[model samples]
Target chain A: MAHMERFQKVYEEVQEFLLGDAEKRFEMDVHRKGYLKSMMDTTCLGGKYNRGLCVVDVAEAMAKDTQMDAAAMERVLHDACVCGWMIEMLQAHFLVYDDIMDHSKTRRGKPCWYLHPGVTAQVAINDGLILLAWATQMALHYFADRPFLAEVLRVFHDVDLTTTIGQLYDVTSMVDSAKLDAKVAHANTTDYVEYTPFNHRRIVVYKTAYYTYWLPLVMGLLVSGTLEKVDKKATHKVAMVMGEYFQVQDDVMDCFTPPEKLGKIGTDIEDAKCSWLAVTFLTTAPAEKVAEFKANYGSTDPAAVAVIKQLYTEQNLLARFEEYEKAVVAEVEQLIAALEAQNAAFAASVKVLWSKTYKRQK
Target chain B: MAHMERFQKVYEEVQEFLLGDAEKRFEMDVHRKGYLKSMMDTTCLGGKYNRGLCVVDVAEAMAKDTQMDAAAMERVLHDACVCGWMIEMLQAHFLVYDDIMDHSKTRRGKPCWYLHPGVTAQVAINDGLILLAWATQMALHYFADRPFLAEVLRVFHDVDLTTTIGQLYDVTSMVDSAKLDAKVAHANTTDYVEYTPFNHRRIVVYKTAYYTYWLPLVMGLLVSGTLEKVDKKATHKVAMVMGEYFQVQDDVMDCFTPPEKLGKIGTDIEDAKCSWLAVTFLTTAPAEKVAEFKANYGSTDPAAVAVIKQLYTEQNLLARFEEYEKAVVAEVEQLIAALEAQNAAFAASVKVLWSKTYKRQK
Candidate 1:
């Protein structure tokens, strides 16, 4: 808990550093500085901070074998926390633009940054750019002299690029249920990949898994100076599986949970997102039911939405998801067990993440 | 000339690398890969490539002292060209978003990427992101083994952040002639900095100069193993002056040059941009003239725009700009001379850039 508080405090530290640097570098007046600070606070703060915390936790776990003095350990963690916050900043950057692209109204229980008074889509777009820039700036400033600087920066760039590509897939893969006929006709002539399980897996692994699970895991390994000791391929394999499992849980929660309970309304159905639920339904349901599901899936009409929800229930997707979740957990546990023989600390670090998210409702 | 051709060829090379890598890393199909390739060709190619070529030229100039075999020289130049193309890619990244933000319909004699039939604002935003991501990816892929990779990335990050800040200043500093009264009232209660010469210099230096002049110069210095030999601060100072002078010329041309000659219609007045012309007039004009200028500035009406144009002539801003240009040129020549004493090759590289933009009509 103390480490969590310290991790949270890094947000303030980064904010102060960025604001000060902006002032001196850009000759920013107090007013402009305030504008940037406000944007950073609104968008970068108030997330669950699960990603950032995981970085610190993993780093702490990995550092156990190194055996350092208290001051040295503190220094290691301070840097680790900074790296953790960079992931959070990156998350904020993506969310700002994602919200704009998704045309969402609320984020973190407040109006979306783009929806703020006097903030146009143009302003928000630049602000998102600023968030991303600051993330890199923070990395360079904190780790300028580190031996691992390039590797750290490389990870950041890799995740950022991968995530954007994932977003592209998500955006282009939307199926307009209203135009099912046209979609089918177009597929006949064009190489139109339907929103199948394969496509869903691509979107999840790329858009969600890499940034969410793999980035933090790799950041932890790199920061703790244990990356060279671990099997990076094995680590990636485990992160992908865990990430897919987590996103599947997310997809399941989106449909079954109420907005009040979930903290955000579900829009996968309305948005025609490539979710595990939709893909599974499409593949498993009878042709007549599939036709009905296709007709009602992406409609904004409440009645149509209700029909989709009924279909989801009637199809027993929750039970199926539970079985899928159990199998995934078993698979990941076995992977971690294999990793434990090579590096126990790293395995324990991953378990920390697993225990937090196992059966999470929100 | 051959080097120039080779420098141009890097675009195709980088595009091929990015397309192939996307296909493999993202498991992208032909359609998605084509989508990315289309965005790349439309936005990243077709630029004059002055910035990219500047990097190559500077690298070539800097590498003169480090004699090696013809093959080594060719390898160095090829790597330099990749770095050069990275700058071009960065430029493309900014232009794609800028065109969207500025709501420009056409870029480089074609519809802005955002205006393409199937490309929405969302797609363009992500595509701009992809362009940026690939620039870093290109740098990493090519220079991963190099000692100066971190420094190269640092320059890219610094320029990217600085340019975005400049864009923020430009976007926020816009004045609506119709809302002058409200602006004044808002300024009374707020620390609203006006669109003055100070603001214009800031925008020009950060937005244009750093990316246009300093980035390529520094990038060349880094790539050629000569960054340690040059005075970075002096290079930045000259770059800022050059950038400001170049932007002033741009502002003057925007109002004075015919669209057919300039190849793009001037919208600084209509858009209420913080141009050198506007700032100069705001500071030096008589009260009555300033009031009239404010009333007519930022107007879409042809008569209002005509009045602003006539006022530019009445005020003889072009004559004034000629004086300013001559002074700036003399100042830059003196700076370059001093740079010549330290590193003649670097100075010569700067001159190559200077010669290209000096008193150009288009």
Candidate 2:
């Protein structure tokens, strides 16, 4: 609850800064001015604010005081909250464009930013990038003279680049540029070999893990100065494990839940998504069943979707996912136990991190 | 010619680094791998190496002696060339996605990267960002230890944000989201307002000038450590004037020249581009002709195109353009003259920069 309030405060501040009711200073006319405000409100708000919260949360954990002096800590926490909002704003940038790229119908119980009534996918390209700039400008404004300013900037750029690379893998694999090269193999798993575990593992690590889990905690560690106290190798190992666990749960949720509950229909099957279930079915399905999967996985037809869903059901993929979730949680708990002796606060932070999302229904 | 040869050498080095014919070691399937290589080649290699060339040229000027102990000079030159290529590669990133966003058909006598038979717009987004990452990585590799490394990165990020803001204006205005935004007023001028000279000037300076002229020369001056010798204010002034002038020529070329010569069908008319011509026509057309201009402009129909073109001819826009061009050139010459007394070599560099594009037919 404390974490969430801080997240709300940070997001509101960032949003207010972005969507100010300023006078028409520049040549941006009423139409563009409205479009920009709509883009920011639609895309940047409504996210679960864990990424922003973690910045202040871990910073406080490093300070090891829930109620440190309100004066100095308040000033420091304000800056830390701004750092958190920067990450959140950057996430907004990613989602606006990613939604368009994936042809997503909805985000956070509403239509995706690109799918909003007045918006087009073309403008989303620049709109998304504008948010990124806003975040960087904010960071420079707040932290230009700080000791870790360069590191903060590097983290932002590095995370942006890594996430883009992951997105390249995700999108290019789905598009299947067969005409460009005879050797190109689509990773949506129309066949057994292309749907290898390596591809799926890469998808998770590059796409989901690095930016989502690694960046937030890394930023926290760097900002809080507990980076030296924490075991760097162990922290990364646990974060990676937790990130993979988080994504696997998401894959399971996609199949397990209904569309109305999730705000939009799940089209991963028809959209040729390189999801974990698809990868697992390819990797672990019987040799004889591979052909059925090859035919059904990437098809847009409803029957093909049913056939793939049936195959996933018959293979007990859900049960396997439950087991996988259990093991990952256990592994993380064990990691926490090992590290708790070294630093209880750090272990508690890692535990709270996964607890935020591993159980979410949406 | 020797200068051109050196630019070519540097370009080759950068191109070779980017487009190595390595086997698909990473999991990007052969098809996607080939698609990416093709995208890079399509976008990166074909640009006139002026941007990249400026980096080395100014660096050489700063060094002032190309033969100052051939070994060390060559080493420094190599690094300078890499910086040049970093800018070049980033430009390729911009072009790839900009082509997609604008729905461009051709660039530099070939189809835009997004229009390549096997490529999709979705993949172009990621591919463009990948190039951004690649450039940053190369910069880090070449200049990580230099005193100006952080400044270089800040410049890269800063320029990227400004360019995106410019792009936002360019694309958003064309879309005219008012029909979608019930709350928005039309900025495309159904009446006597909205398409102002201010908008056009902002578009040119923000989108084209800063990144193109200002960035290359500023980078050159910074890298050469002759930043002290050059008055930064005077340099930026000349560069900005030249940049706006360069874009005006581009807008003219887009309308005046035929597709056969320019290598693409000019869509400034059909696609509702915020061209300098469009702005001037909107701002200066007779009071009675405002409604006619509004009706004829921003239309895809050939008849509407003809009406707009007729209006431009009737308004003697070409005569206005010639006078405007002359004034801008004189202004830049004055700035150059003022700086020439202080830095003859730098003044020559600025003069050569403007001369390269101002008189170009293509």
Candidate 3:
């Protein structure tokens, strides 16, 4: 309830910042104003908002308000909320281009940004870039005359480089890899992908780890003061690993849910994604079925999917995925417990990450 | 000859860097490669490699030897070429998208990047963004090791910011403005839109100034070590004014030269561009004739083009444009003479800028 209330308060500030024109925001025409408003709607509410909230959660836990007045908390809230918008802003920049890259007709049941009638794909992309730049600019403006705004810029750019490199790795894997056979048993109804832990599994972490989880969380920690006490590299390693595991659990959950049930068929197989499922499929499937499984599972035909599911049933891949998923959470839970043993405020972040991932998949 | 030798060597290196087998080197192919290649082409050979070579010229002028050593000059050439590429990149990025925004089909004798098969308009926009990032990264990598690299980055980003802002202004203008009317006494026929210095002149400079003359030349001067004494703010003003004049000359030349003479037809009116000719026409033309001219020239009708041309003749807008053109050239000449008067290395750059604009039109 606190997180929800806090989220609402901070998000409203960002909404007002983005949606309400601080500059007499007059829309001369319906189309232009509507288009920008829709952008805010999708960016803030559509994607997961947890990474944003954690900045505040960590801030509150670290600030230890027993010694401070309520005013300080408000400042922390303001700072936390700005970072939250930055997270969303990062997503908008990516989606503005990614949606176009994925060629999806709709996002959250609405037309894709580039798909709007009045906007060309080019304008959409530029608008996306503008949105990203100005969002950071807003942060800079908010922190103007504040200490360490320059550091924010530096840290932001550094985080961006890593995230972009990760994205590059992702896009590279999705391209038709002639060397890797598509028929390779990547996933199925029976033997889920979590049974393995190789390239496929690593991808789960690379794509989502730093960006979706650890990067934003660590960004908050590093920006907020508690990061100074911790071993930076060690913290990163843990964050990266936990983030990876959490992503694996997400993949695990999706196996239990069909594409239609998920509101969209996942891109995992069709794009030849290297998910934890792929690792499990490769390592755990019988040697006899392995040859046939890899080639057919990712194909477009309904029969191919059906056949893949049949093989999955025989191998019990889905159960294997669930089993692996639990093991990873168990491992992470122990790690969180150790962090809590230190009585560190930063540990709150890890605890929250573990519980969130556990509940998220459960 | 000096420029050519360096050109060949750097061209080879760019090709090497582009086609390198290094996994990370092929950054373009994995994500925004297609856009990267298109941008490379547009900003390089697409414009006759003149701006690129001119940068080499600036470097060569500042060099101690008549013959710039191939090995020593490679980096300078690369940076120079990049400076040129920045223009093309920006143009390509904007044009590729603008085509979609403008609903255009052809650019540089090919289907616009967006319309090309396998190049969805949606992705084409991202492709443009990728090209821009490609250019920026090149600046950081190529110039980052140098002493004035920060200055180079400053100019590059500053110019880029200006150009893109100009674009935003134009977009906003289109969305916000009601309309404007003009006359033949106002119509300037025989000159480029820039020479006229219309209210809309900002876009032309934003599009061309940094890309064409200012950025490349300044980059060369900075890299060559002679730029230490040169004033950046002064260069900015002169380069911007000169760049606009240069663009205006291009428009007027398009009409008188014919396709045979100038290689392209005049489209200022037909494109409904906010050109000097349009503003000149609005200010100078008789009311009835301006209406008739607008009827014919405002849209894509060649008959309209013909009527607009006749109206220009009736009012001698062409001669006035030419007169303004000479005045702009005179101002540029005065800058060159001042540089000459000071015997500053700055003269060479100023001359190159003048020649660049003059040569394009002639």
Candidate 4:
């Protein structure tokens, strides 16, 4: 609890810095600003602060003393929370650019940020990148004294690189270009990539996992041990799996959860999003249904949207997702507990992590 | 010359490994179907392969090996060319996305990738990230064993982050949201930003230095006991200046060079591209013309394009750029020579690089 306060402070501080004068600029035109802010409110703000809390979580778990450790605790807490917020801010950056890319009319019951006037397409991209830099400079500045800071920065870049790969897969899969053979392996899977929930899940994990799971948790872990000596490749493999399920469930809610609870009806279907939920449906569902759904989903005709909706009704992806969500939650909970049992400190940091994703309402 | 064959083998080898198909299904019909390839054509193919060649050049300059050093040469060439190609690929990726963001029609002489049917706007953002990852992964595989590969990777990320800042500046400049902010900075003095070749040069250098100059040239340089221990911070400071000017001249050529010869025309004025040539004109030209050019040049209207063209004609931005390009070229030439003089191998490498950029077309 002592550390959680630090997370909250760090969150407020990073937000203060990450936001800069943009909000004040928005205040000059309330309607113009609300469009972007609303997306931030629904999606960016309520993300589980577990990752931030973990910044101080493992440090204390290892030290088990704040007796005279206030300064160290304070430093760790700031680093962890800022690191956590960086992930959130990074997601925010990606989402803003993504919304522009999707050209979606609404996000969380409001017009998307790029849809606002004077905010051209270029701004969305550049803005997403700027948020990441803000995240980076903040991290570098905070970790300057920690001997392990370079490794942390390396990890941060590694995570960013991996996520970019996942995002690219999403783009390539969505538009499947069969003609380019300059490098054939890049797209040979087109037939395999039909709009399916599993594929969507894959992209979600890439887009979310490391930043959310591996980056924060491991960064906290690094302060206590020679994680640097551990086999990094093996660690990433394990983290990647943990990250996948953490994000796949978000796909579950997109289709099954009600708009009031979910904020907006699932637009991934209309947006032609590459989600694991979609990949699952494409792979598991009947041939005819998949064809029908693909035909009608992304078209402008509301009738087209309706036909796809009908297939969704018939398939009951919502019911299926509920069952799937429960199972994965149990599986993750079990794995995390087992891991923590084997290595007390590392396990503890990894444990509450699942909770943050599990209980997230928004 | 001897090392060229070694890189050729590496390029050919990577082209092979990259081709073998795998289970990862690409979802995009466009990307898989050659739309991505179509978008990639100019960026990836038919270039002089000079950047990749630079890897060998620097490797040759830094190393005392014959062409038989396949493994070593392969690594250098792969890093250099990929960095070079990757930088361009990143630029092309950005351009593809930028076209959609700017709502432009054609790019690299074809329909913009995102505008294709079956491909949505999100593809643009996702595609850019993917291209970047391929480049990064390619770098890691080759340079992972080398000393300071982390620095090389870190430098690329830094360049990427800085480019975003430049991108933000570019976006705001076009929208003129900072019109009032200019009161403190001076409207005409936008020569620093609006017209200064520095930013444009920096932009190119941002892509080329890490990818072209440093990643390949300095990748080898890092191994050289000579360059290894220099204050990297100071090296990057040099990178920022030298790289930017390198790219600035490239931009100036868009107008000064022939379209059919280069297979592209100058759209700097129409696209509201920031370049030194333009900045020089702003600083030197009369106030009324500057105001008119600023107000009208960035517009899509043909008349506006024409009006700006006449203004530049009257103002002699071209002559200014030509003179400036000579001075800067001489300046960087001296810098490269000094560094190369430290090692005979580095000098020879610089020659290959200089010929490709300044003497060769495309």
Candidate 5:
């Protein structure tokens, strides 16, 4: 809570830097500057700052051994915050475009950026490009002098490519259950392939895990000058494990948790997302149960949504999820324990991340 | 033309490098590998390759004095080609999303990527991200060892941000003439602002010129270790002038040229684009003429489009365009003359670019 409160101060700094820079660059164009400020405020704020805060926490943990003056410490913290916010900005870009792609209505407890009055899809799409460009520019502006600048850029680029690839896997694997139902009703031969566990895991790692888990940790190590000492593969392994666990929790929460608690209404069922819950149910459920799930999945009807939720409860998915979460925690701890011998501070930082998302509700 | 033929060889190399890299990264996922290949081929190819060829021409000009062995020369050309194609890839990313934003149907003489069978808006959006990511990755892969990599990255980043800002300016300045007509019909108070020549120039410089002219020239300068010798502001000025001229030519061509000659149907009037021709008419035409033009602009009706075209003819836009082209060429020639005192090779390279676009029909 204390960290988050302090993190808020950095958020103000980021907003100032971005808006001020934009204003200077666009001094003559009031409308362009205003549009940029509004777009940033709308999409970049109101997120769970978990990914960003992790950058600060991990960087702080890694810097404990460094002897520095007050000014140096402030600079270090400021840079970390900027990097953290850059990640959040990246997240904002993705979410804004994803909402349009997913045809999502609400996000972060408000209407999606595209759904705002007077903003067309064209504006939203361009706004997303601007958000992404700002994120890249921020990285360059703050980190250009850093020795590990190239490595940091590589991490960002690699994660971006990986996430987009994961998105392709996800969208291509989608089974429009409504369309499937139609095909079935018409006695048409359906060629829709059921997304396997491998597909779901692939999507989770590439789309969700790399950016959500690995990026901030790697960024922290880079900023603290500790990345050279750390085993990159081991760090990636632990982060991937944590990321998968985190995504599974998100999937479960989307179904079982209320909209108010979760901050947005769940649309996994309606969007026919290749979520962990759906994959598990499809892989493990009986033939008739699978058919029933399919019939109810991806329908906008309230009853269809209720039927899907009812199936989740009847199948004891919540308890199963709890069990899975425990196993994941145990596995991640074991992985971290091995890393402790190599870098105790890094291991502790991983543990901090673990604790934050271990049983998170939102 | 010989340069273009040689550029074709480089195109093969780029495609090979991108697809091979993707195949290696996604060895386990054939579907992802296949999707990436298809997306690249669909969106990245079939352009005029003028911007890319400019990179090659400028670099070759800069390297004229450097005495290198055959292998070294081949390597230099290879690197130049890669950078050139990277710009093209960046262009592909923009066009894919821009088409979606503009509600465009055909591109490169075929259906837009999003309009293709089996590809949804979600897939196209994600594919654009992937294209952008690959462009970034390609830069990192090829230029990481270069001493000027940081400057190169900054150029790409700046151009991207500027272009998006330009897009916002263009989109926001758009006046739906049909909507304006309806407002007039209903006697509703319309608050739409007319875009000025300043607004049009801003869009041209930021959206069109920076990426089209400045980027290729600066990239050549960077690659040849000549940026430090050249005056950055002069290069920017010349590029912006060229970019503006090129865009005005494009705007005129959009109205005057046949679809077969232009490769795609013009939608500037129907889309309410703030083209140079439209701005010229809006700013210079008589009040009643402007009103008549607006009455028929931004309408889907064929008659409305014909009326708009007739206004262009009645206003003698083509003759005005030719006069504008002559003045721009003279100005550019004078600018190149100034550059000749600094570097003759660079001046010659600028001439090559100017000659390519001067009075071009497509």
Candidate 6:
């Protein structure tokens, strides 16, 4: 309930920042305003709001309630919330462009932003760029006066470039795989992907973990001045591990979860994704089925999908995922425990956030 | 020969900044390095390098020969060239994405970046964003230590946001027109565009004029400290007029020039662009041909294109273009001459640059 209340406040603040702050906002022509509003809603909202909430979660835990009074606490919380909303805005920027790039038709159970009438792929590209600019602008507005503004800007820049490179790797992995698929012998499927563990983990760490997990969490540390006190490298280490863990969960879910529960059809199987499951299957599947797996893995045919799914089941992949998930959590917990030895407040905050989704299902 | 020599140095500098600055650059993976290099060459080098040269040209004329000696002049000229290359880089960012958004197949006689085998639309989107980052990155690399960093950053942001908004208007205009086409009679022609002089001019000012004409010239002034020395409003006024004139020339060439001469087929008519010629033809075409113009214009059919061309010729659109071009240039020259009355050196720089492009054919 407390978490829900916190998320509600952030959602309201960000909504105001993006939509209601008329003077600060660029003048969206009357006709295009609705499209912008719809885009913000679909792309920024409808997520679990866990990452958005983690900003406040980390800030409050790090700050001392006994030493720091309520007003200072409120200021820290507000800024943390601003950072929280910024993370959401940054996520919106990537997702809108990603959907177009991936040819995805829907996100969050609605048609993807670009597919909406009055929102063409051309306009969406610019809109995506604008959304990124908005995130940086908001960062400048709140933190420009801070002593750490340059460092903060650099952090945002590094994260942006990192994630962008990660996206390039992610897509190029698919593009490269599709090229190989042309030489191979499959017709109906979408993926003849060239995948490796290195590439898959690269996507997870850069695309999923850094921005989704590390950024919101570390950005909270940034605003709380915790990054100044502690070596932030440990926190980045923790976030990267957990971020990869979260994506592995997502990749695991895509094949195992049904369409209704997942809120979308599993496209990783059809989209030639360099998914972790594919990486494992490539290594673990028997030599006889390796050829069949490559042919059937990324296909659209229900039978081909079934063949791939059946292979995973026979290989005890769900069991392997449990093993992978447990190992990663243990690794992350050791990280937090070591930090807990140094800063109880920071580590406690990291623990609560990490535990929240260590083994999340939906 | 001096002009060619100037461009050669800047081109070499930018290439080093993009390609050879190994320690200063991000470590792109081997797979992606070639892609990055290819993208830079196609997008950044394909232009005629005029805008790229103007930054240096304007800066040189502003630097005093007596107060600033030859060595200092070369240093100023070098920084000016850096800004000039920055403009070319910025232009590359816009053009790469524009080609994708416009579904263009070729640019500057080569396949569009997205059309390349290893590149995906998704990857190109991120590459475009990276190219933008590279522009700002280079800006900070040069000007970050300067006292005017904030203002310099703001100028880049303003240009980026302005051009993005302009792009939105351009696409939405097409989207709006296509919506109307559903209610109209044409099956082949891309029409139903609702345009007025206001929106068209808005596009020119926000999209083409600000980024293309004003930013590079003013950015040179910003670097040279002329902005601090003079009010610089006159410079902007001159650039704005010249920018609109440049675009008018572009629109005229789209219809009048042959595909071989223009380097590509003119798609303004096919793509349902809100060109100056389109606006004029819509207003001036005879009442009997109004229906035919709507039906035949923006069609991809050779016969349909022939019909629109015939109509433009019948209406003497070339004569109309000459009149429009002369009026804009005359207006621009007045602004430059006024600036000359105030700051002869600064105005001289502006005049040299403007005169070079005053009657450009390509």
Error of 6 at A22 (Å): 8.6
**Candidate scoring better on DockQ of 1 and 4:** 1
Q: Rank candidates, DockQ, best first.
A: 2, 5, 1, 6, 4, 3
Fnat for candidate 5 (0 to 1): 0.41
lDDT tens per residue, model 3, B31-95? 24433444456434444555667667776666643346777666665667655555455555656
Residue A16's lDDT within candidate 3 is: 62
lDDT of 5 by residue, A130-244 (tens): 8888888887888878786777778887888888877776776674322321112222113325557787887788888999999999998878777877889999999999998
Residues A1-362, model 4: lDDT tens digits: 55666666676676555344444321222332342343344335653455556656755555443232778655555566666666666676666766765566555565555655444454556656656666666665566566666666667666776676566655555554343333232322334455555556557666677776777767766654436433455445546666776676666666556766664455766655666556666766798887776676555576776676667667776666668778776776666666655555556655555556664666
As for candidate 5, its clashing pairs are none
Clashes of 1: 0
TM-score, each model? 0.94, 0.90, 0.68, 0.75, 0.94, 0.89
Across residues A1-362, which tens digit of lDDT does each residue of candidate 3 receive? 25667676766666566444422322223333454555556544665566777766766676672344678667766686677677767667777676766666655455666676555464565567656554555565566665545445445544444455345445435443322222222122333332335445445554466666765665566446556665565566667667776776666544555544343345555444556666666777777787777667556677776666677677787778668667776776666666666646777766765566664633
Clashing pairs in 1: none
The count of backbone overlaps in candidate 3 is 39
Instruction: Give DockQ for candidates 1 onward, in order.
Output: 0.40, 0.41, 0.12, 0.21, 0.41, 0.33
Better of 2 and 3 by DockQ: 2
Task: Write one digit per residue (lDDT tens) for candidate 1, span B1-362.
Answer: 43678886777787889899988898887777876777788887776777888888888888877777788677678888888888988899898888888887667777777877667687688888888999999989999898878889998998999999998888777732123221122211021237667888988888888898889888888888898998888999998888888778888988998765665566888777878988888787787788888788877888999998888788889988989989999999999999999988889989998987788776
Q: What TM value does chain B of candidate 3 have?
A: 0.79
For lDDT, candidate 1 versus 3, the one ahead is 1
After best superposition, candidate 6 residue B16: deviation in angstroms?
Answer: 5.4
Question: Which 10 consecutive residues of model 4 chain A have the lowest summed lDDT?
Answer: A24-33
Identify the CAPRI category of the predicted complex in candidate 3.
incorrect
The per-model lDDT (C-alpha) reads 0.82, 0.73, 0.58, 0.56, 0.78, 0.72
Per-residue C-alpha lDDT of model 4 across residues B1-362, encoded as one tens digit per residue: 55556655665554433332112422333334344444345335554555555655564455553344667655554555554444545555556555665675455554455665444455556766555555555555555666655565555555565555445545444333334221122122323343444444434554345444554455445433235523354444445445565566666667566665655455776677666556666777888887886777656688887787788779886677567668767876776666555545555665566666663344
lDDT of 3 at B229: 59
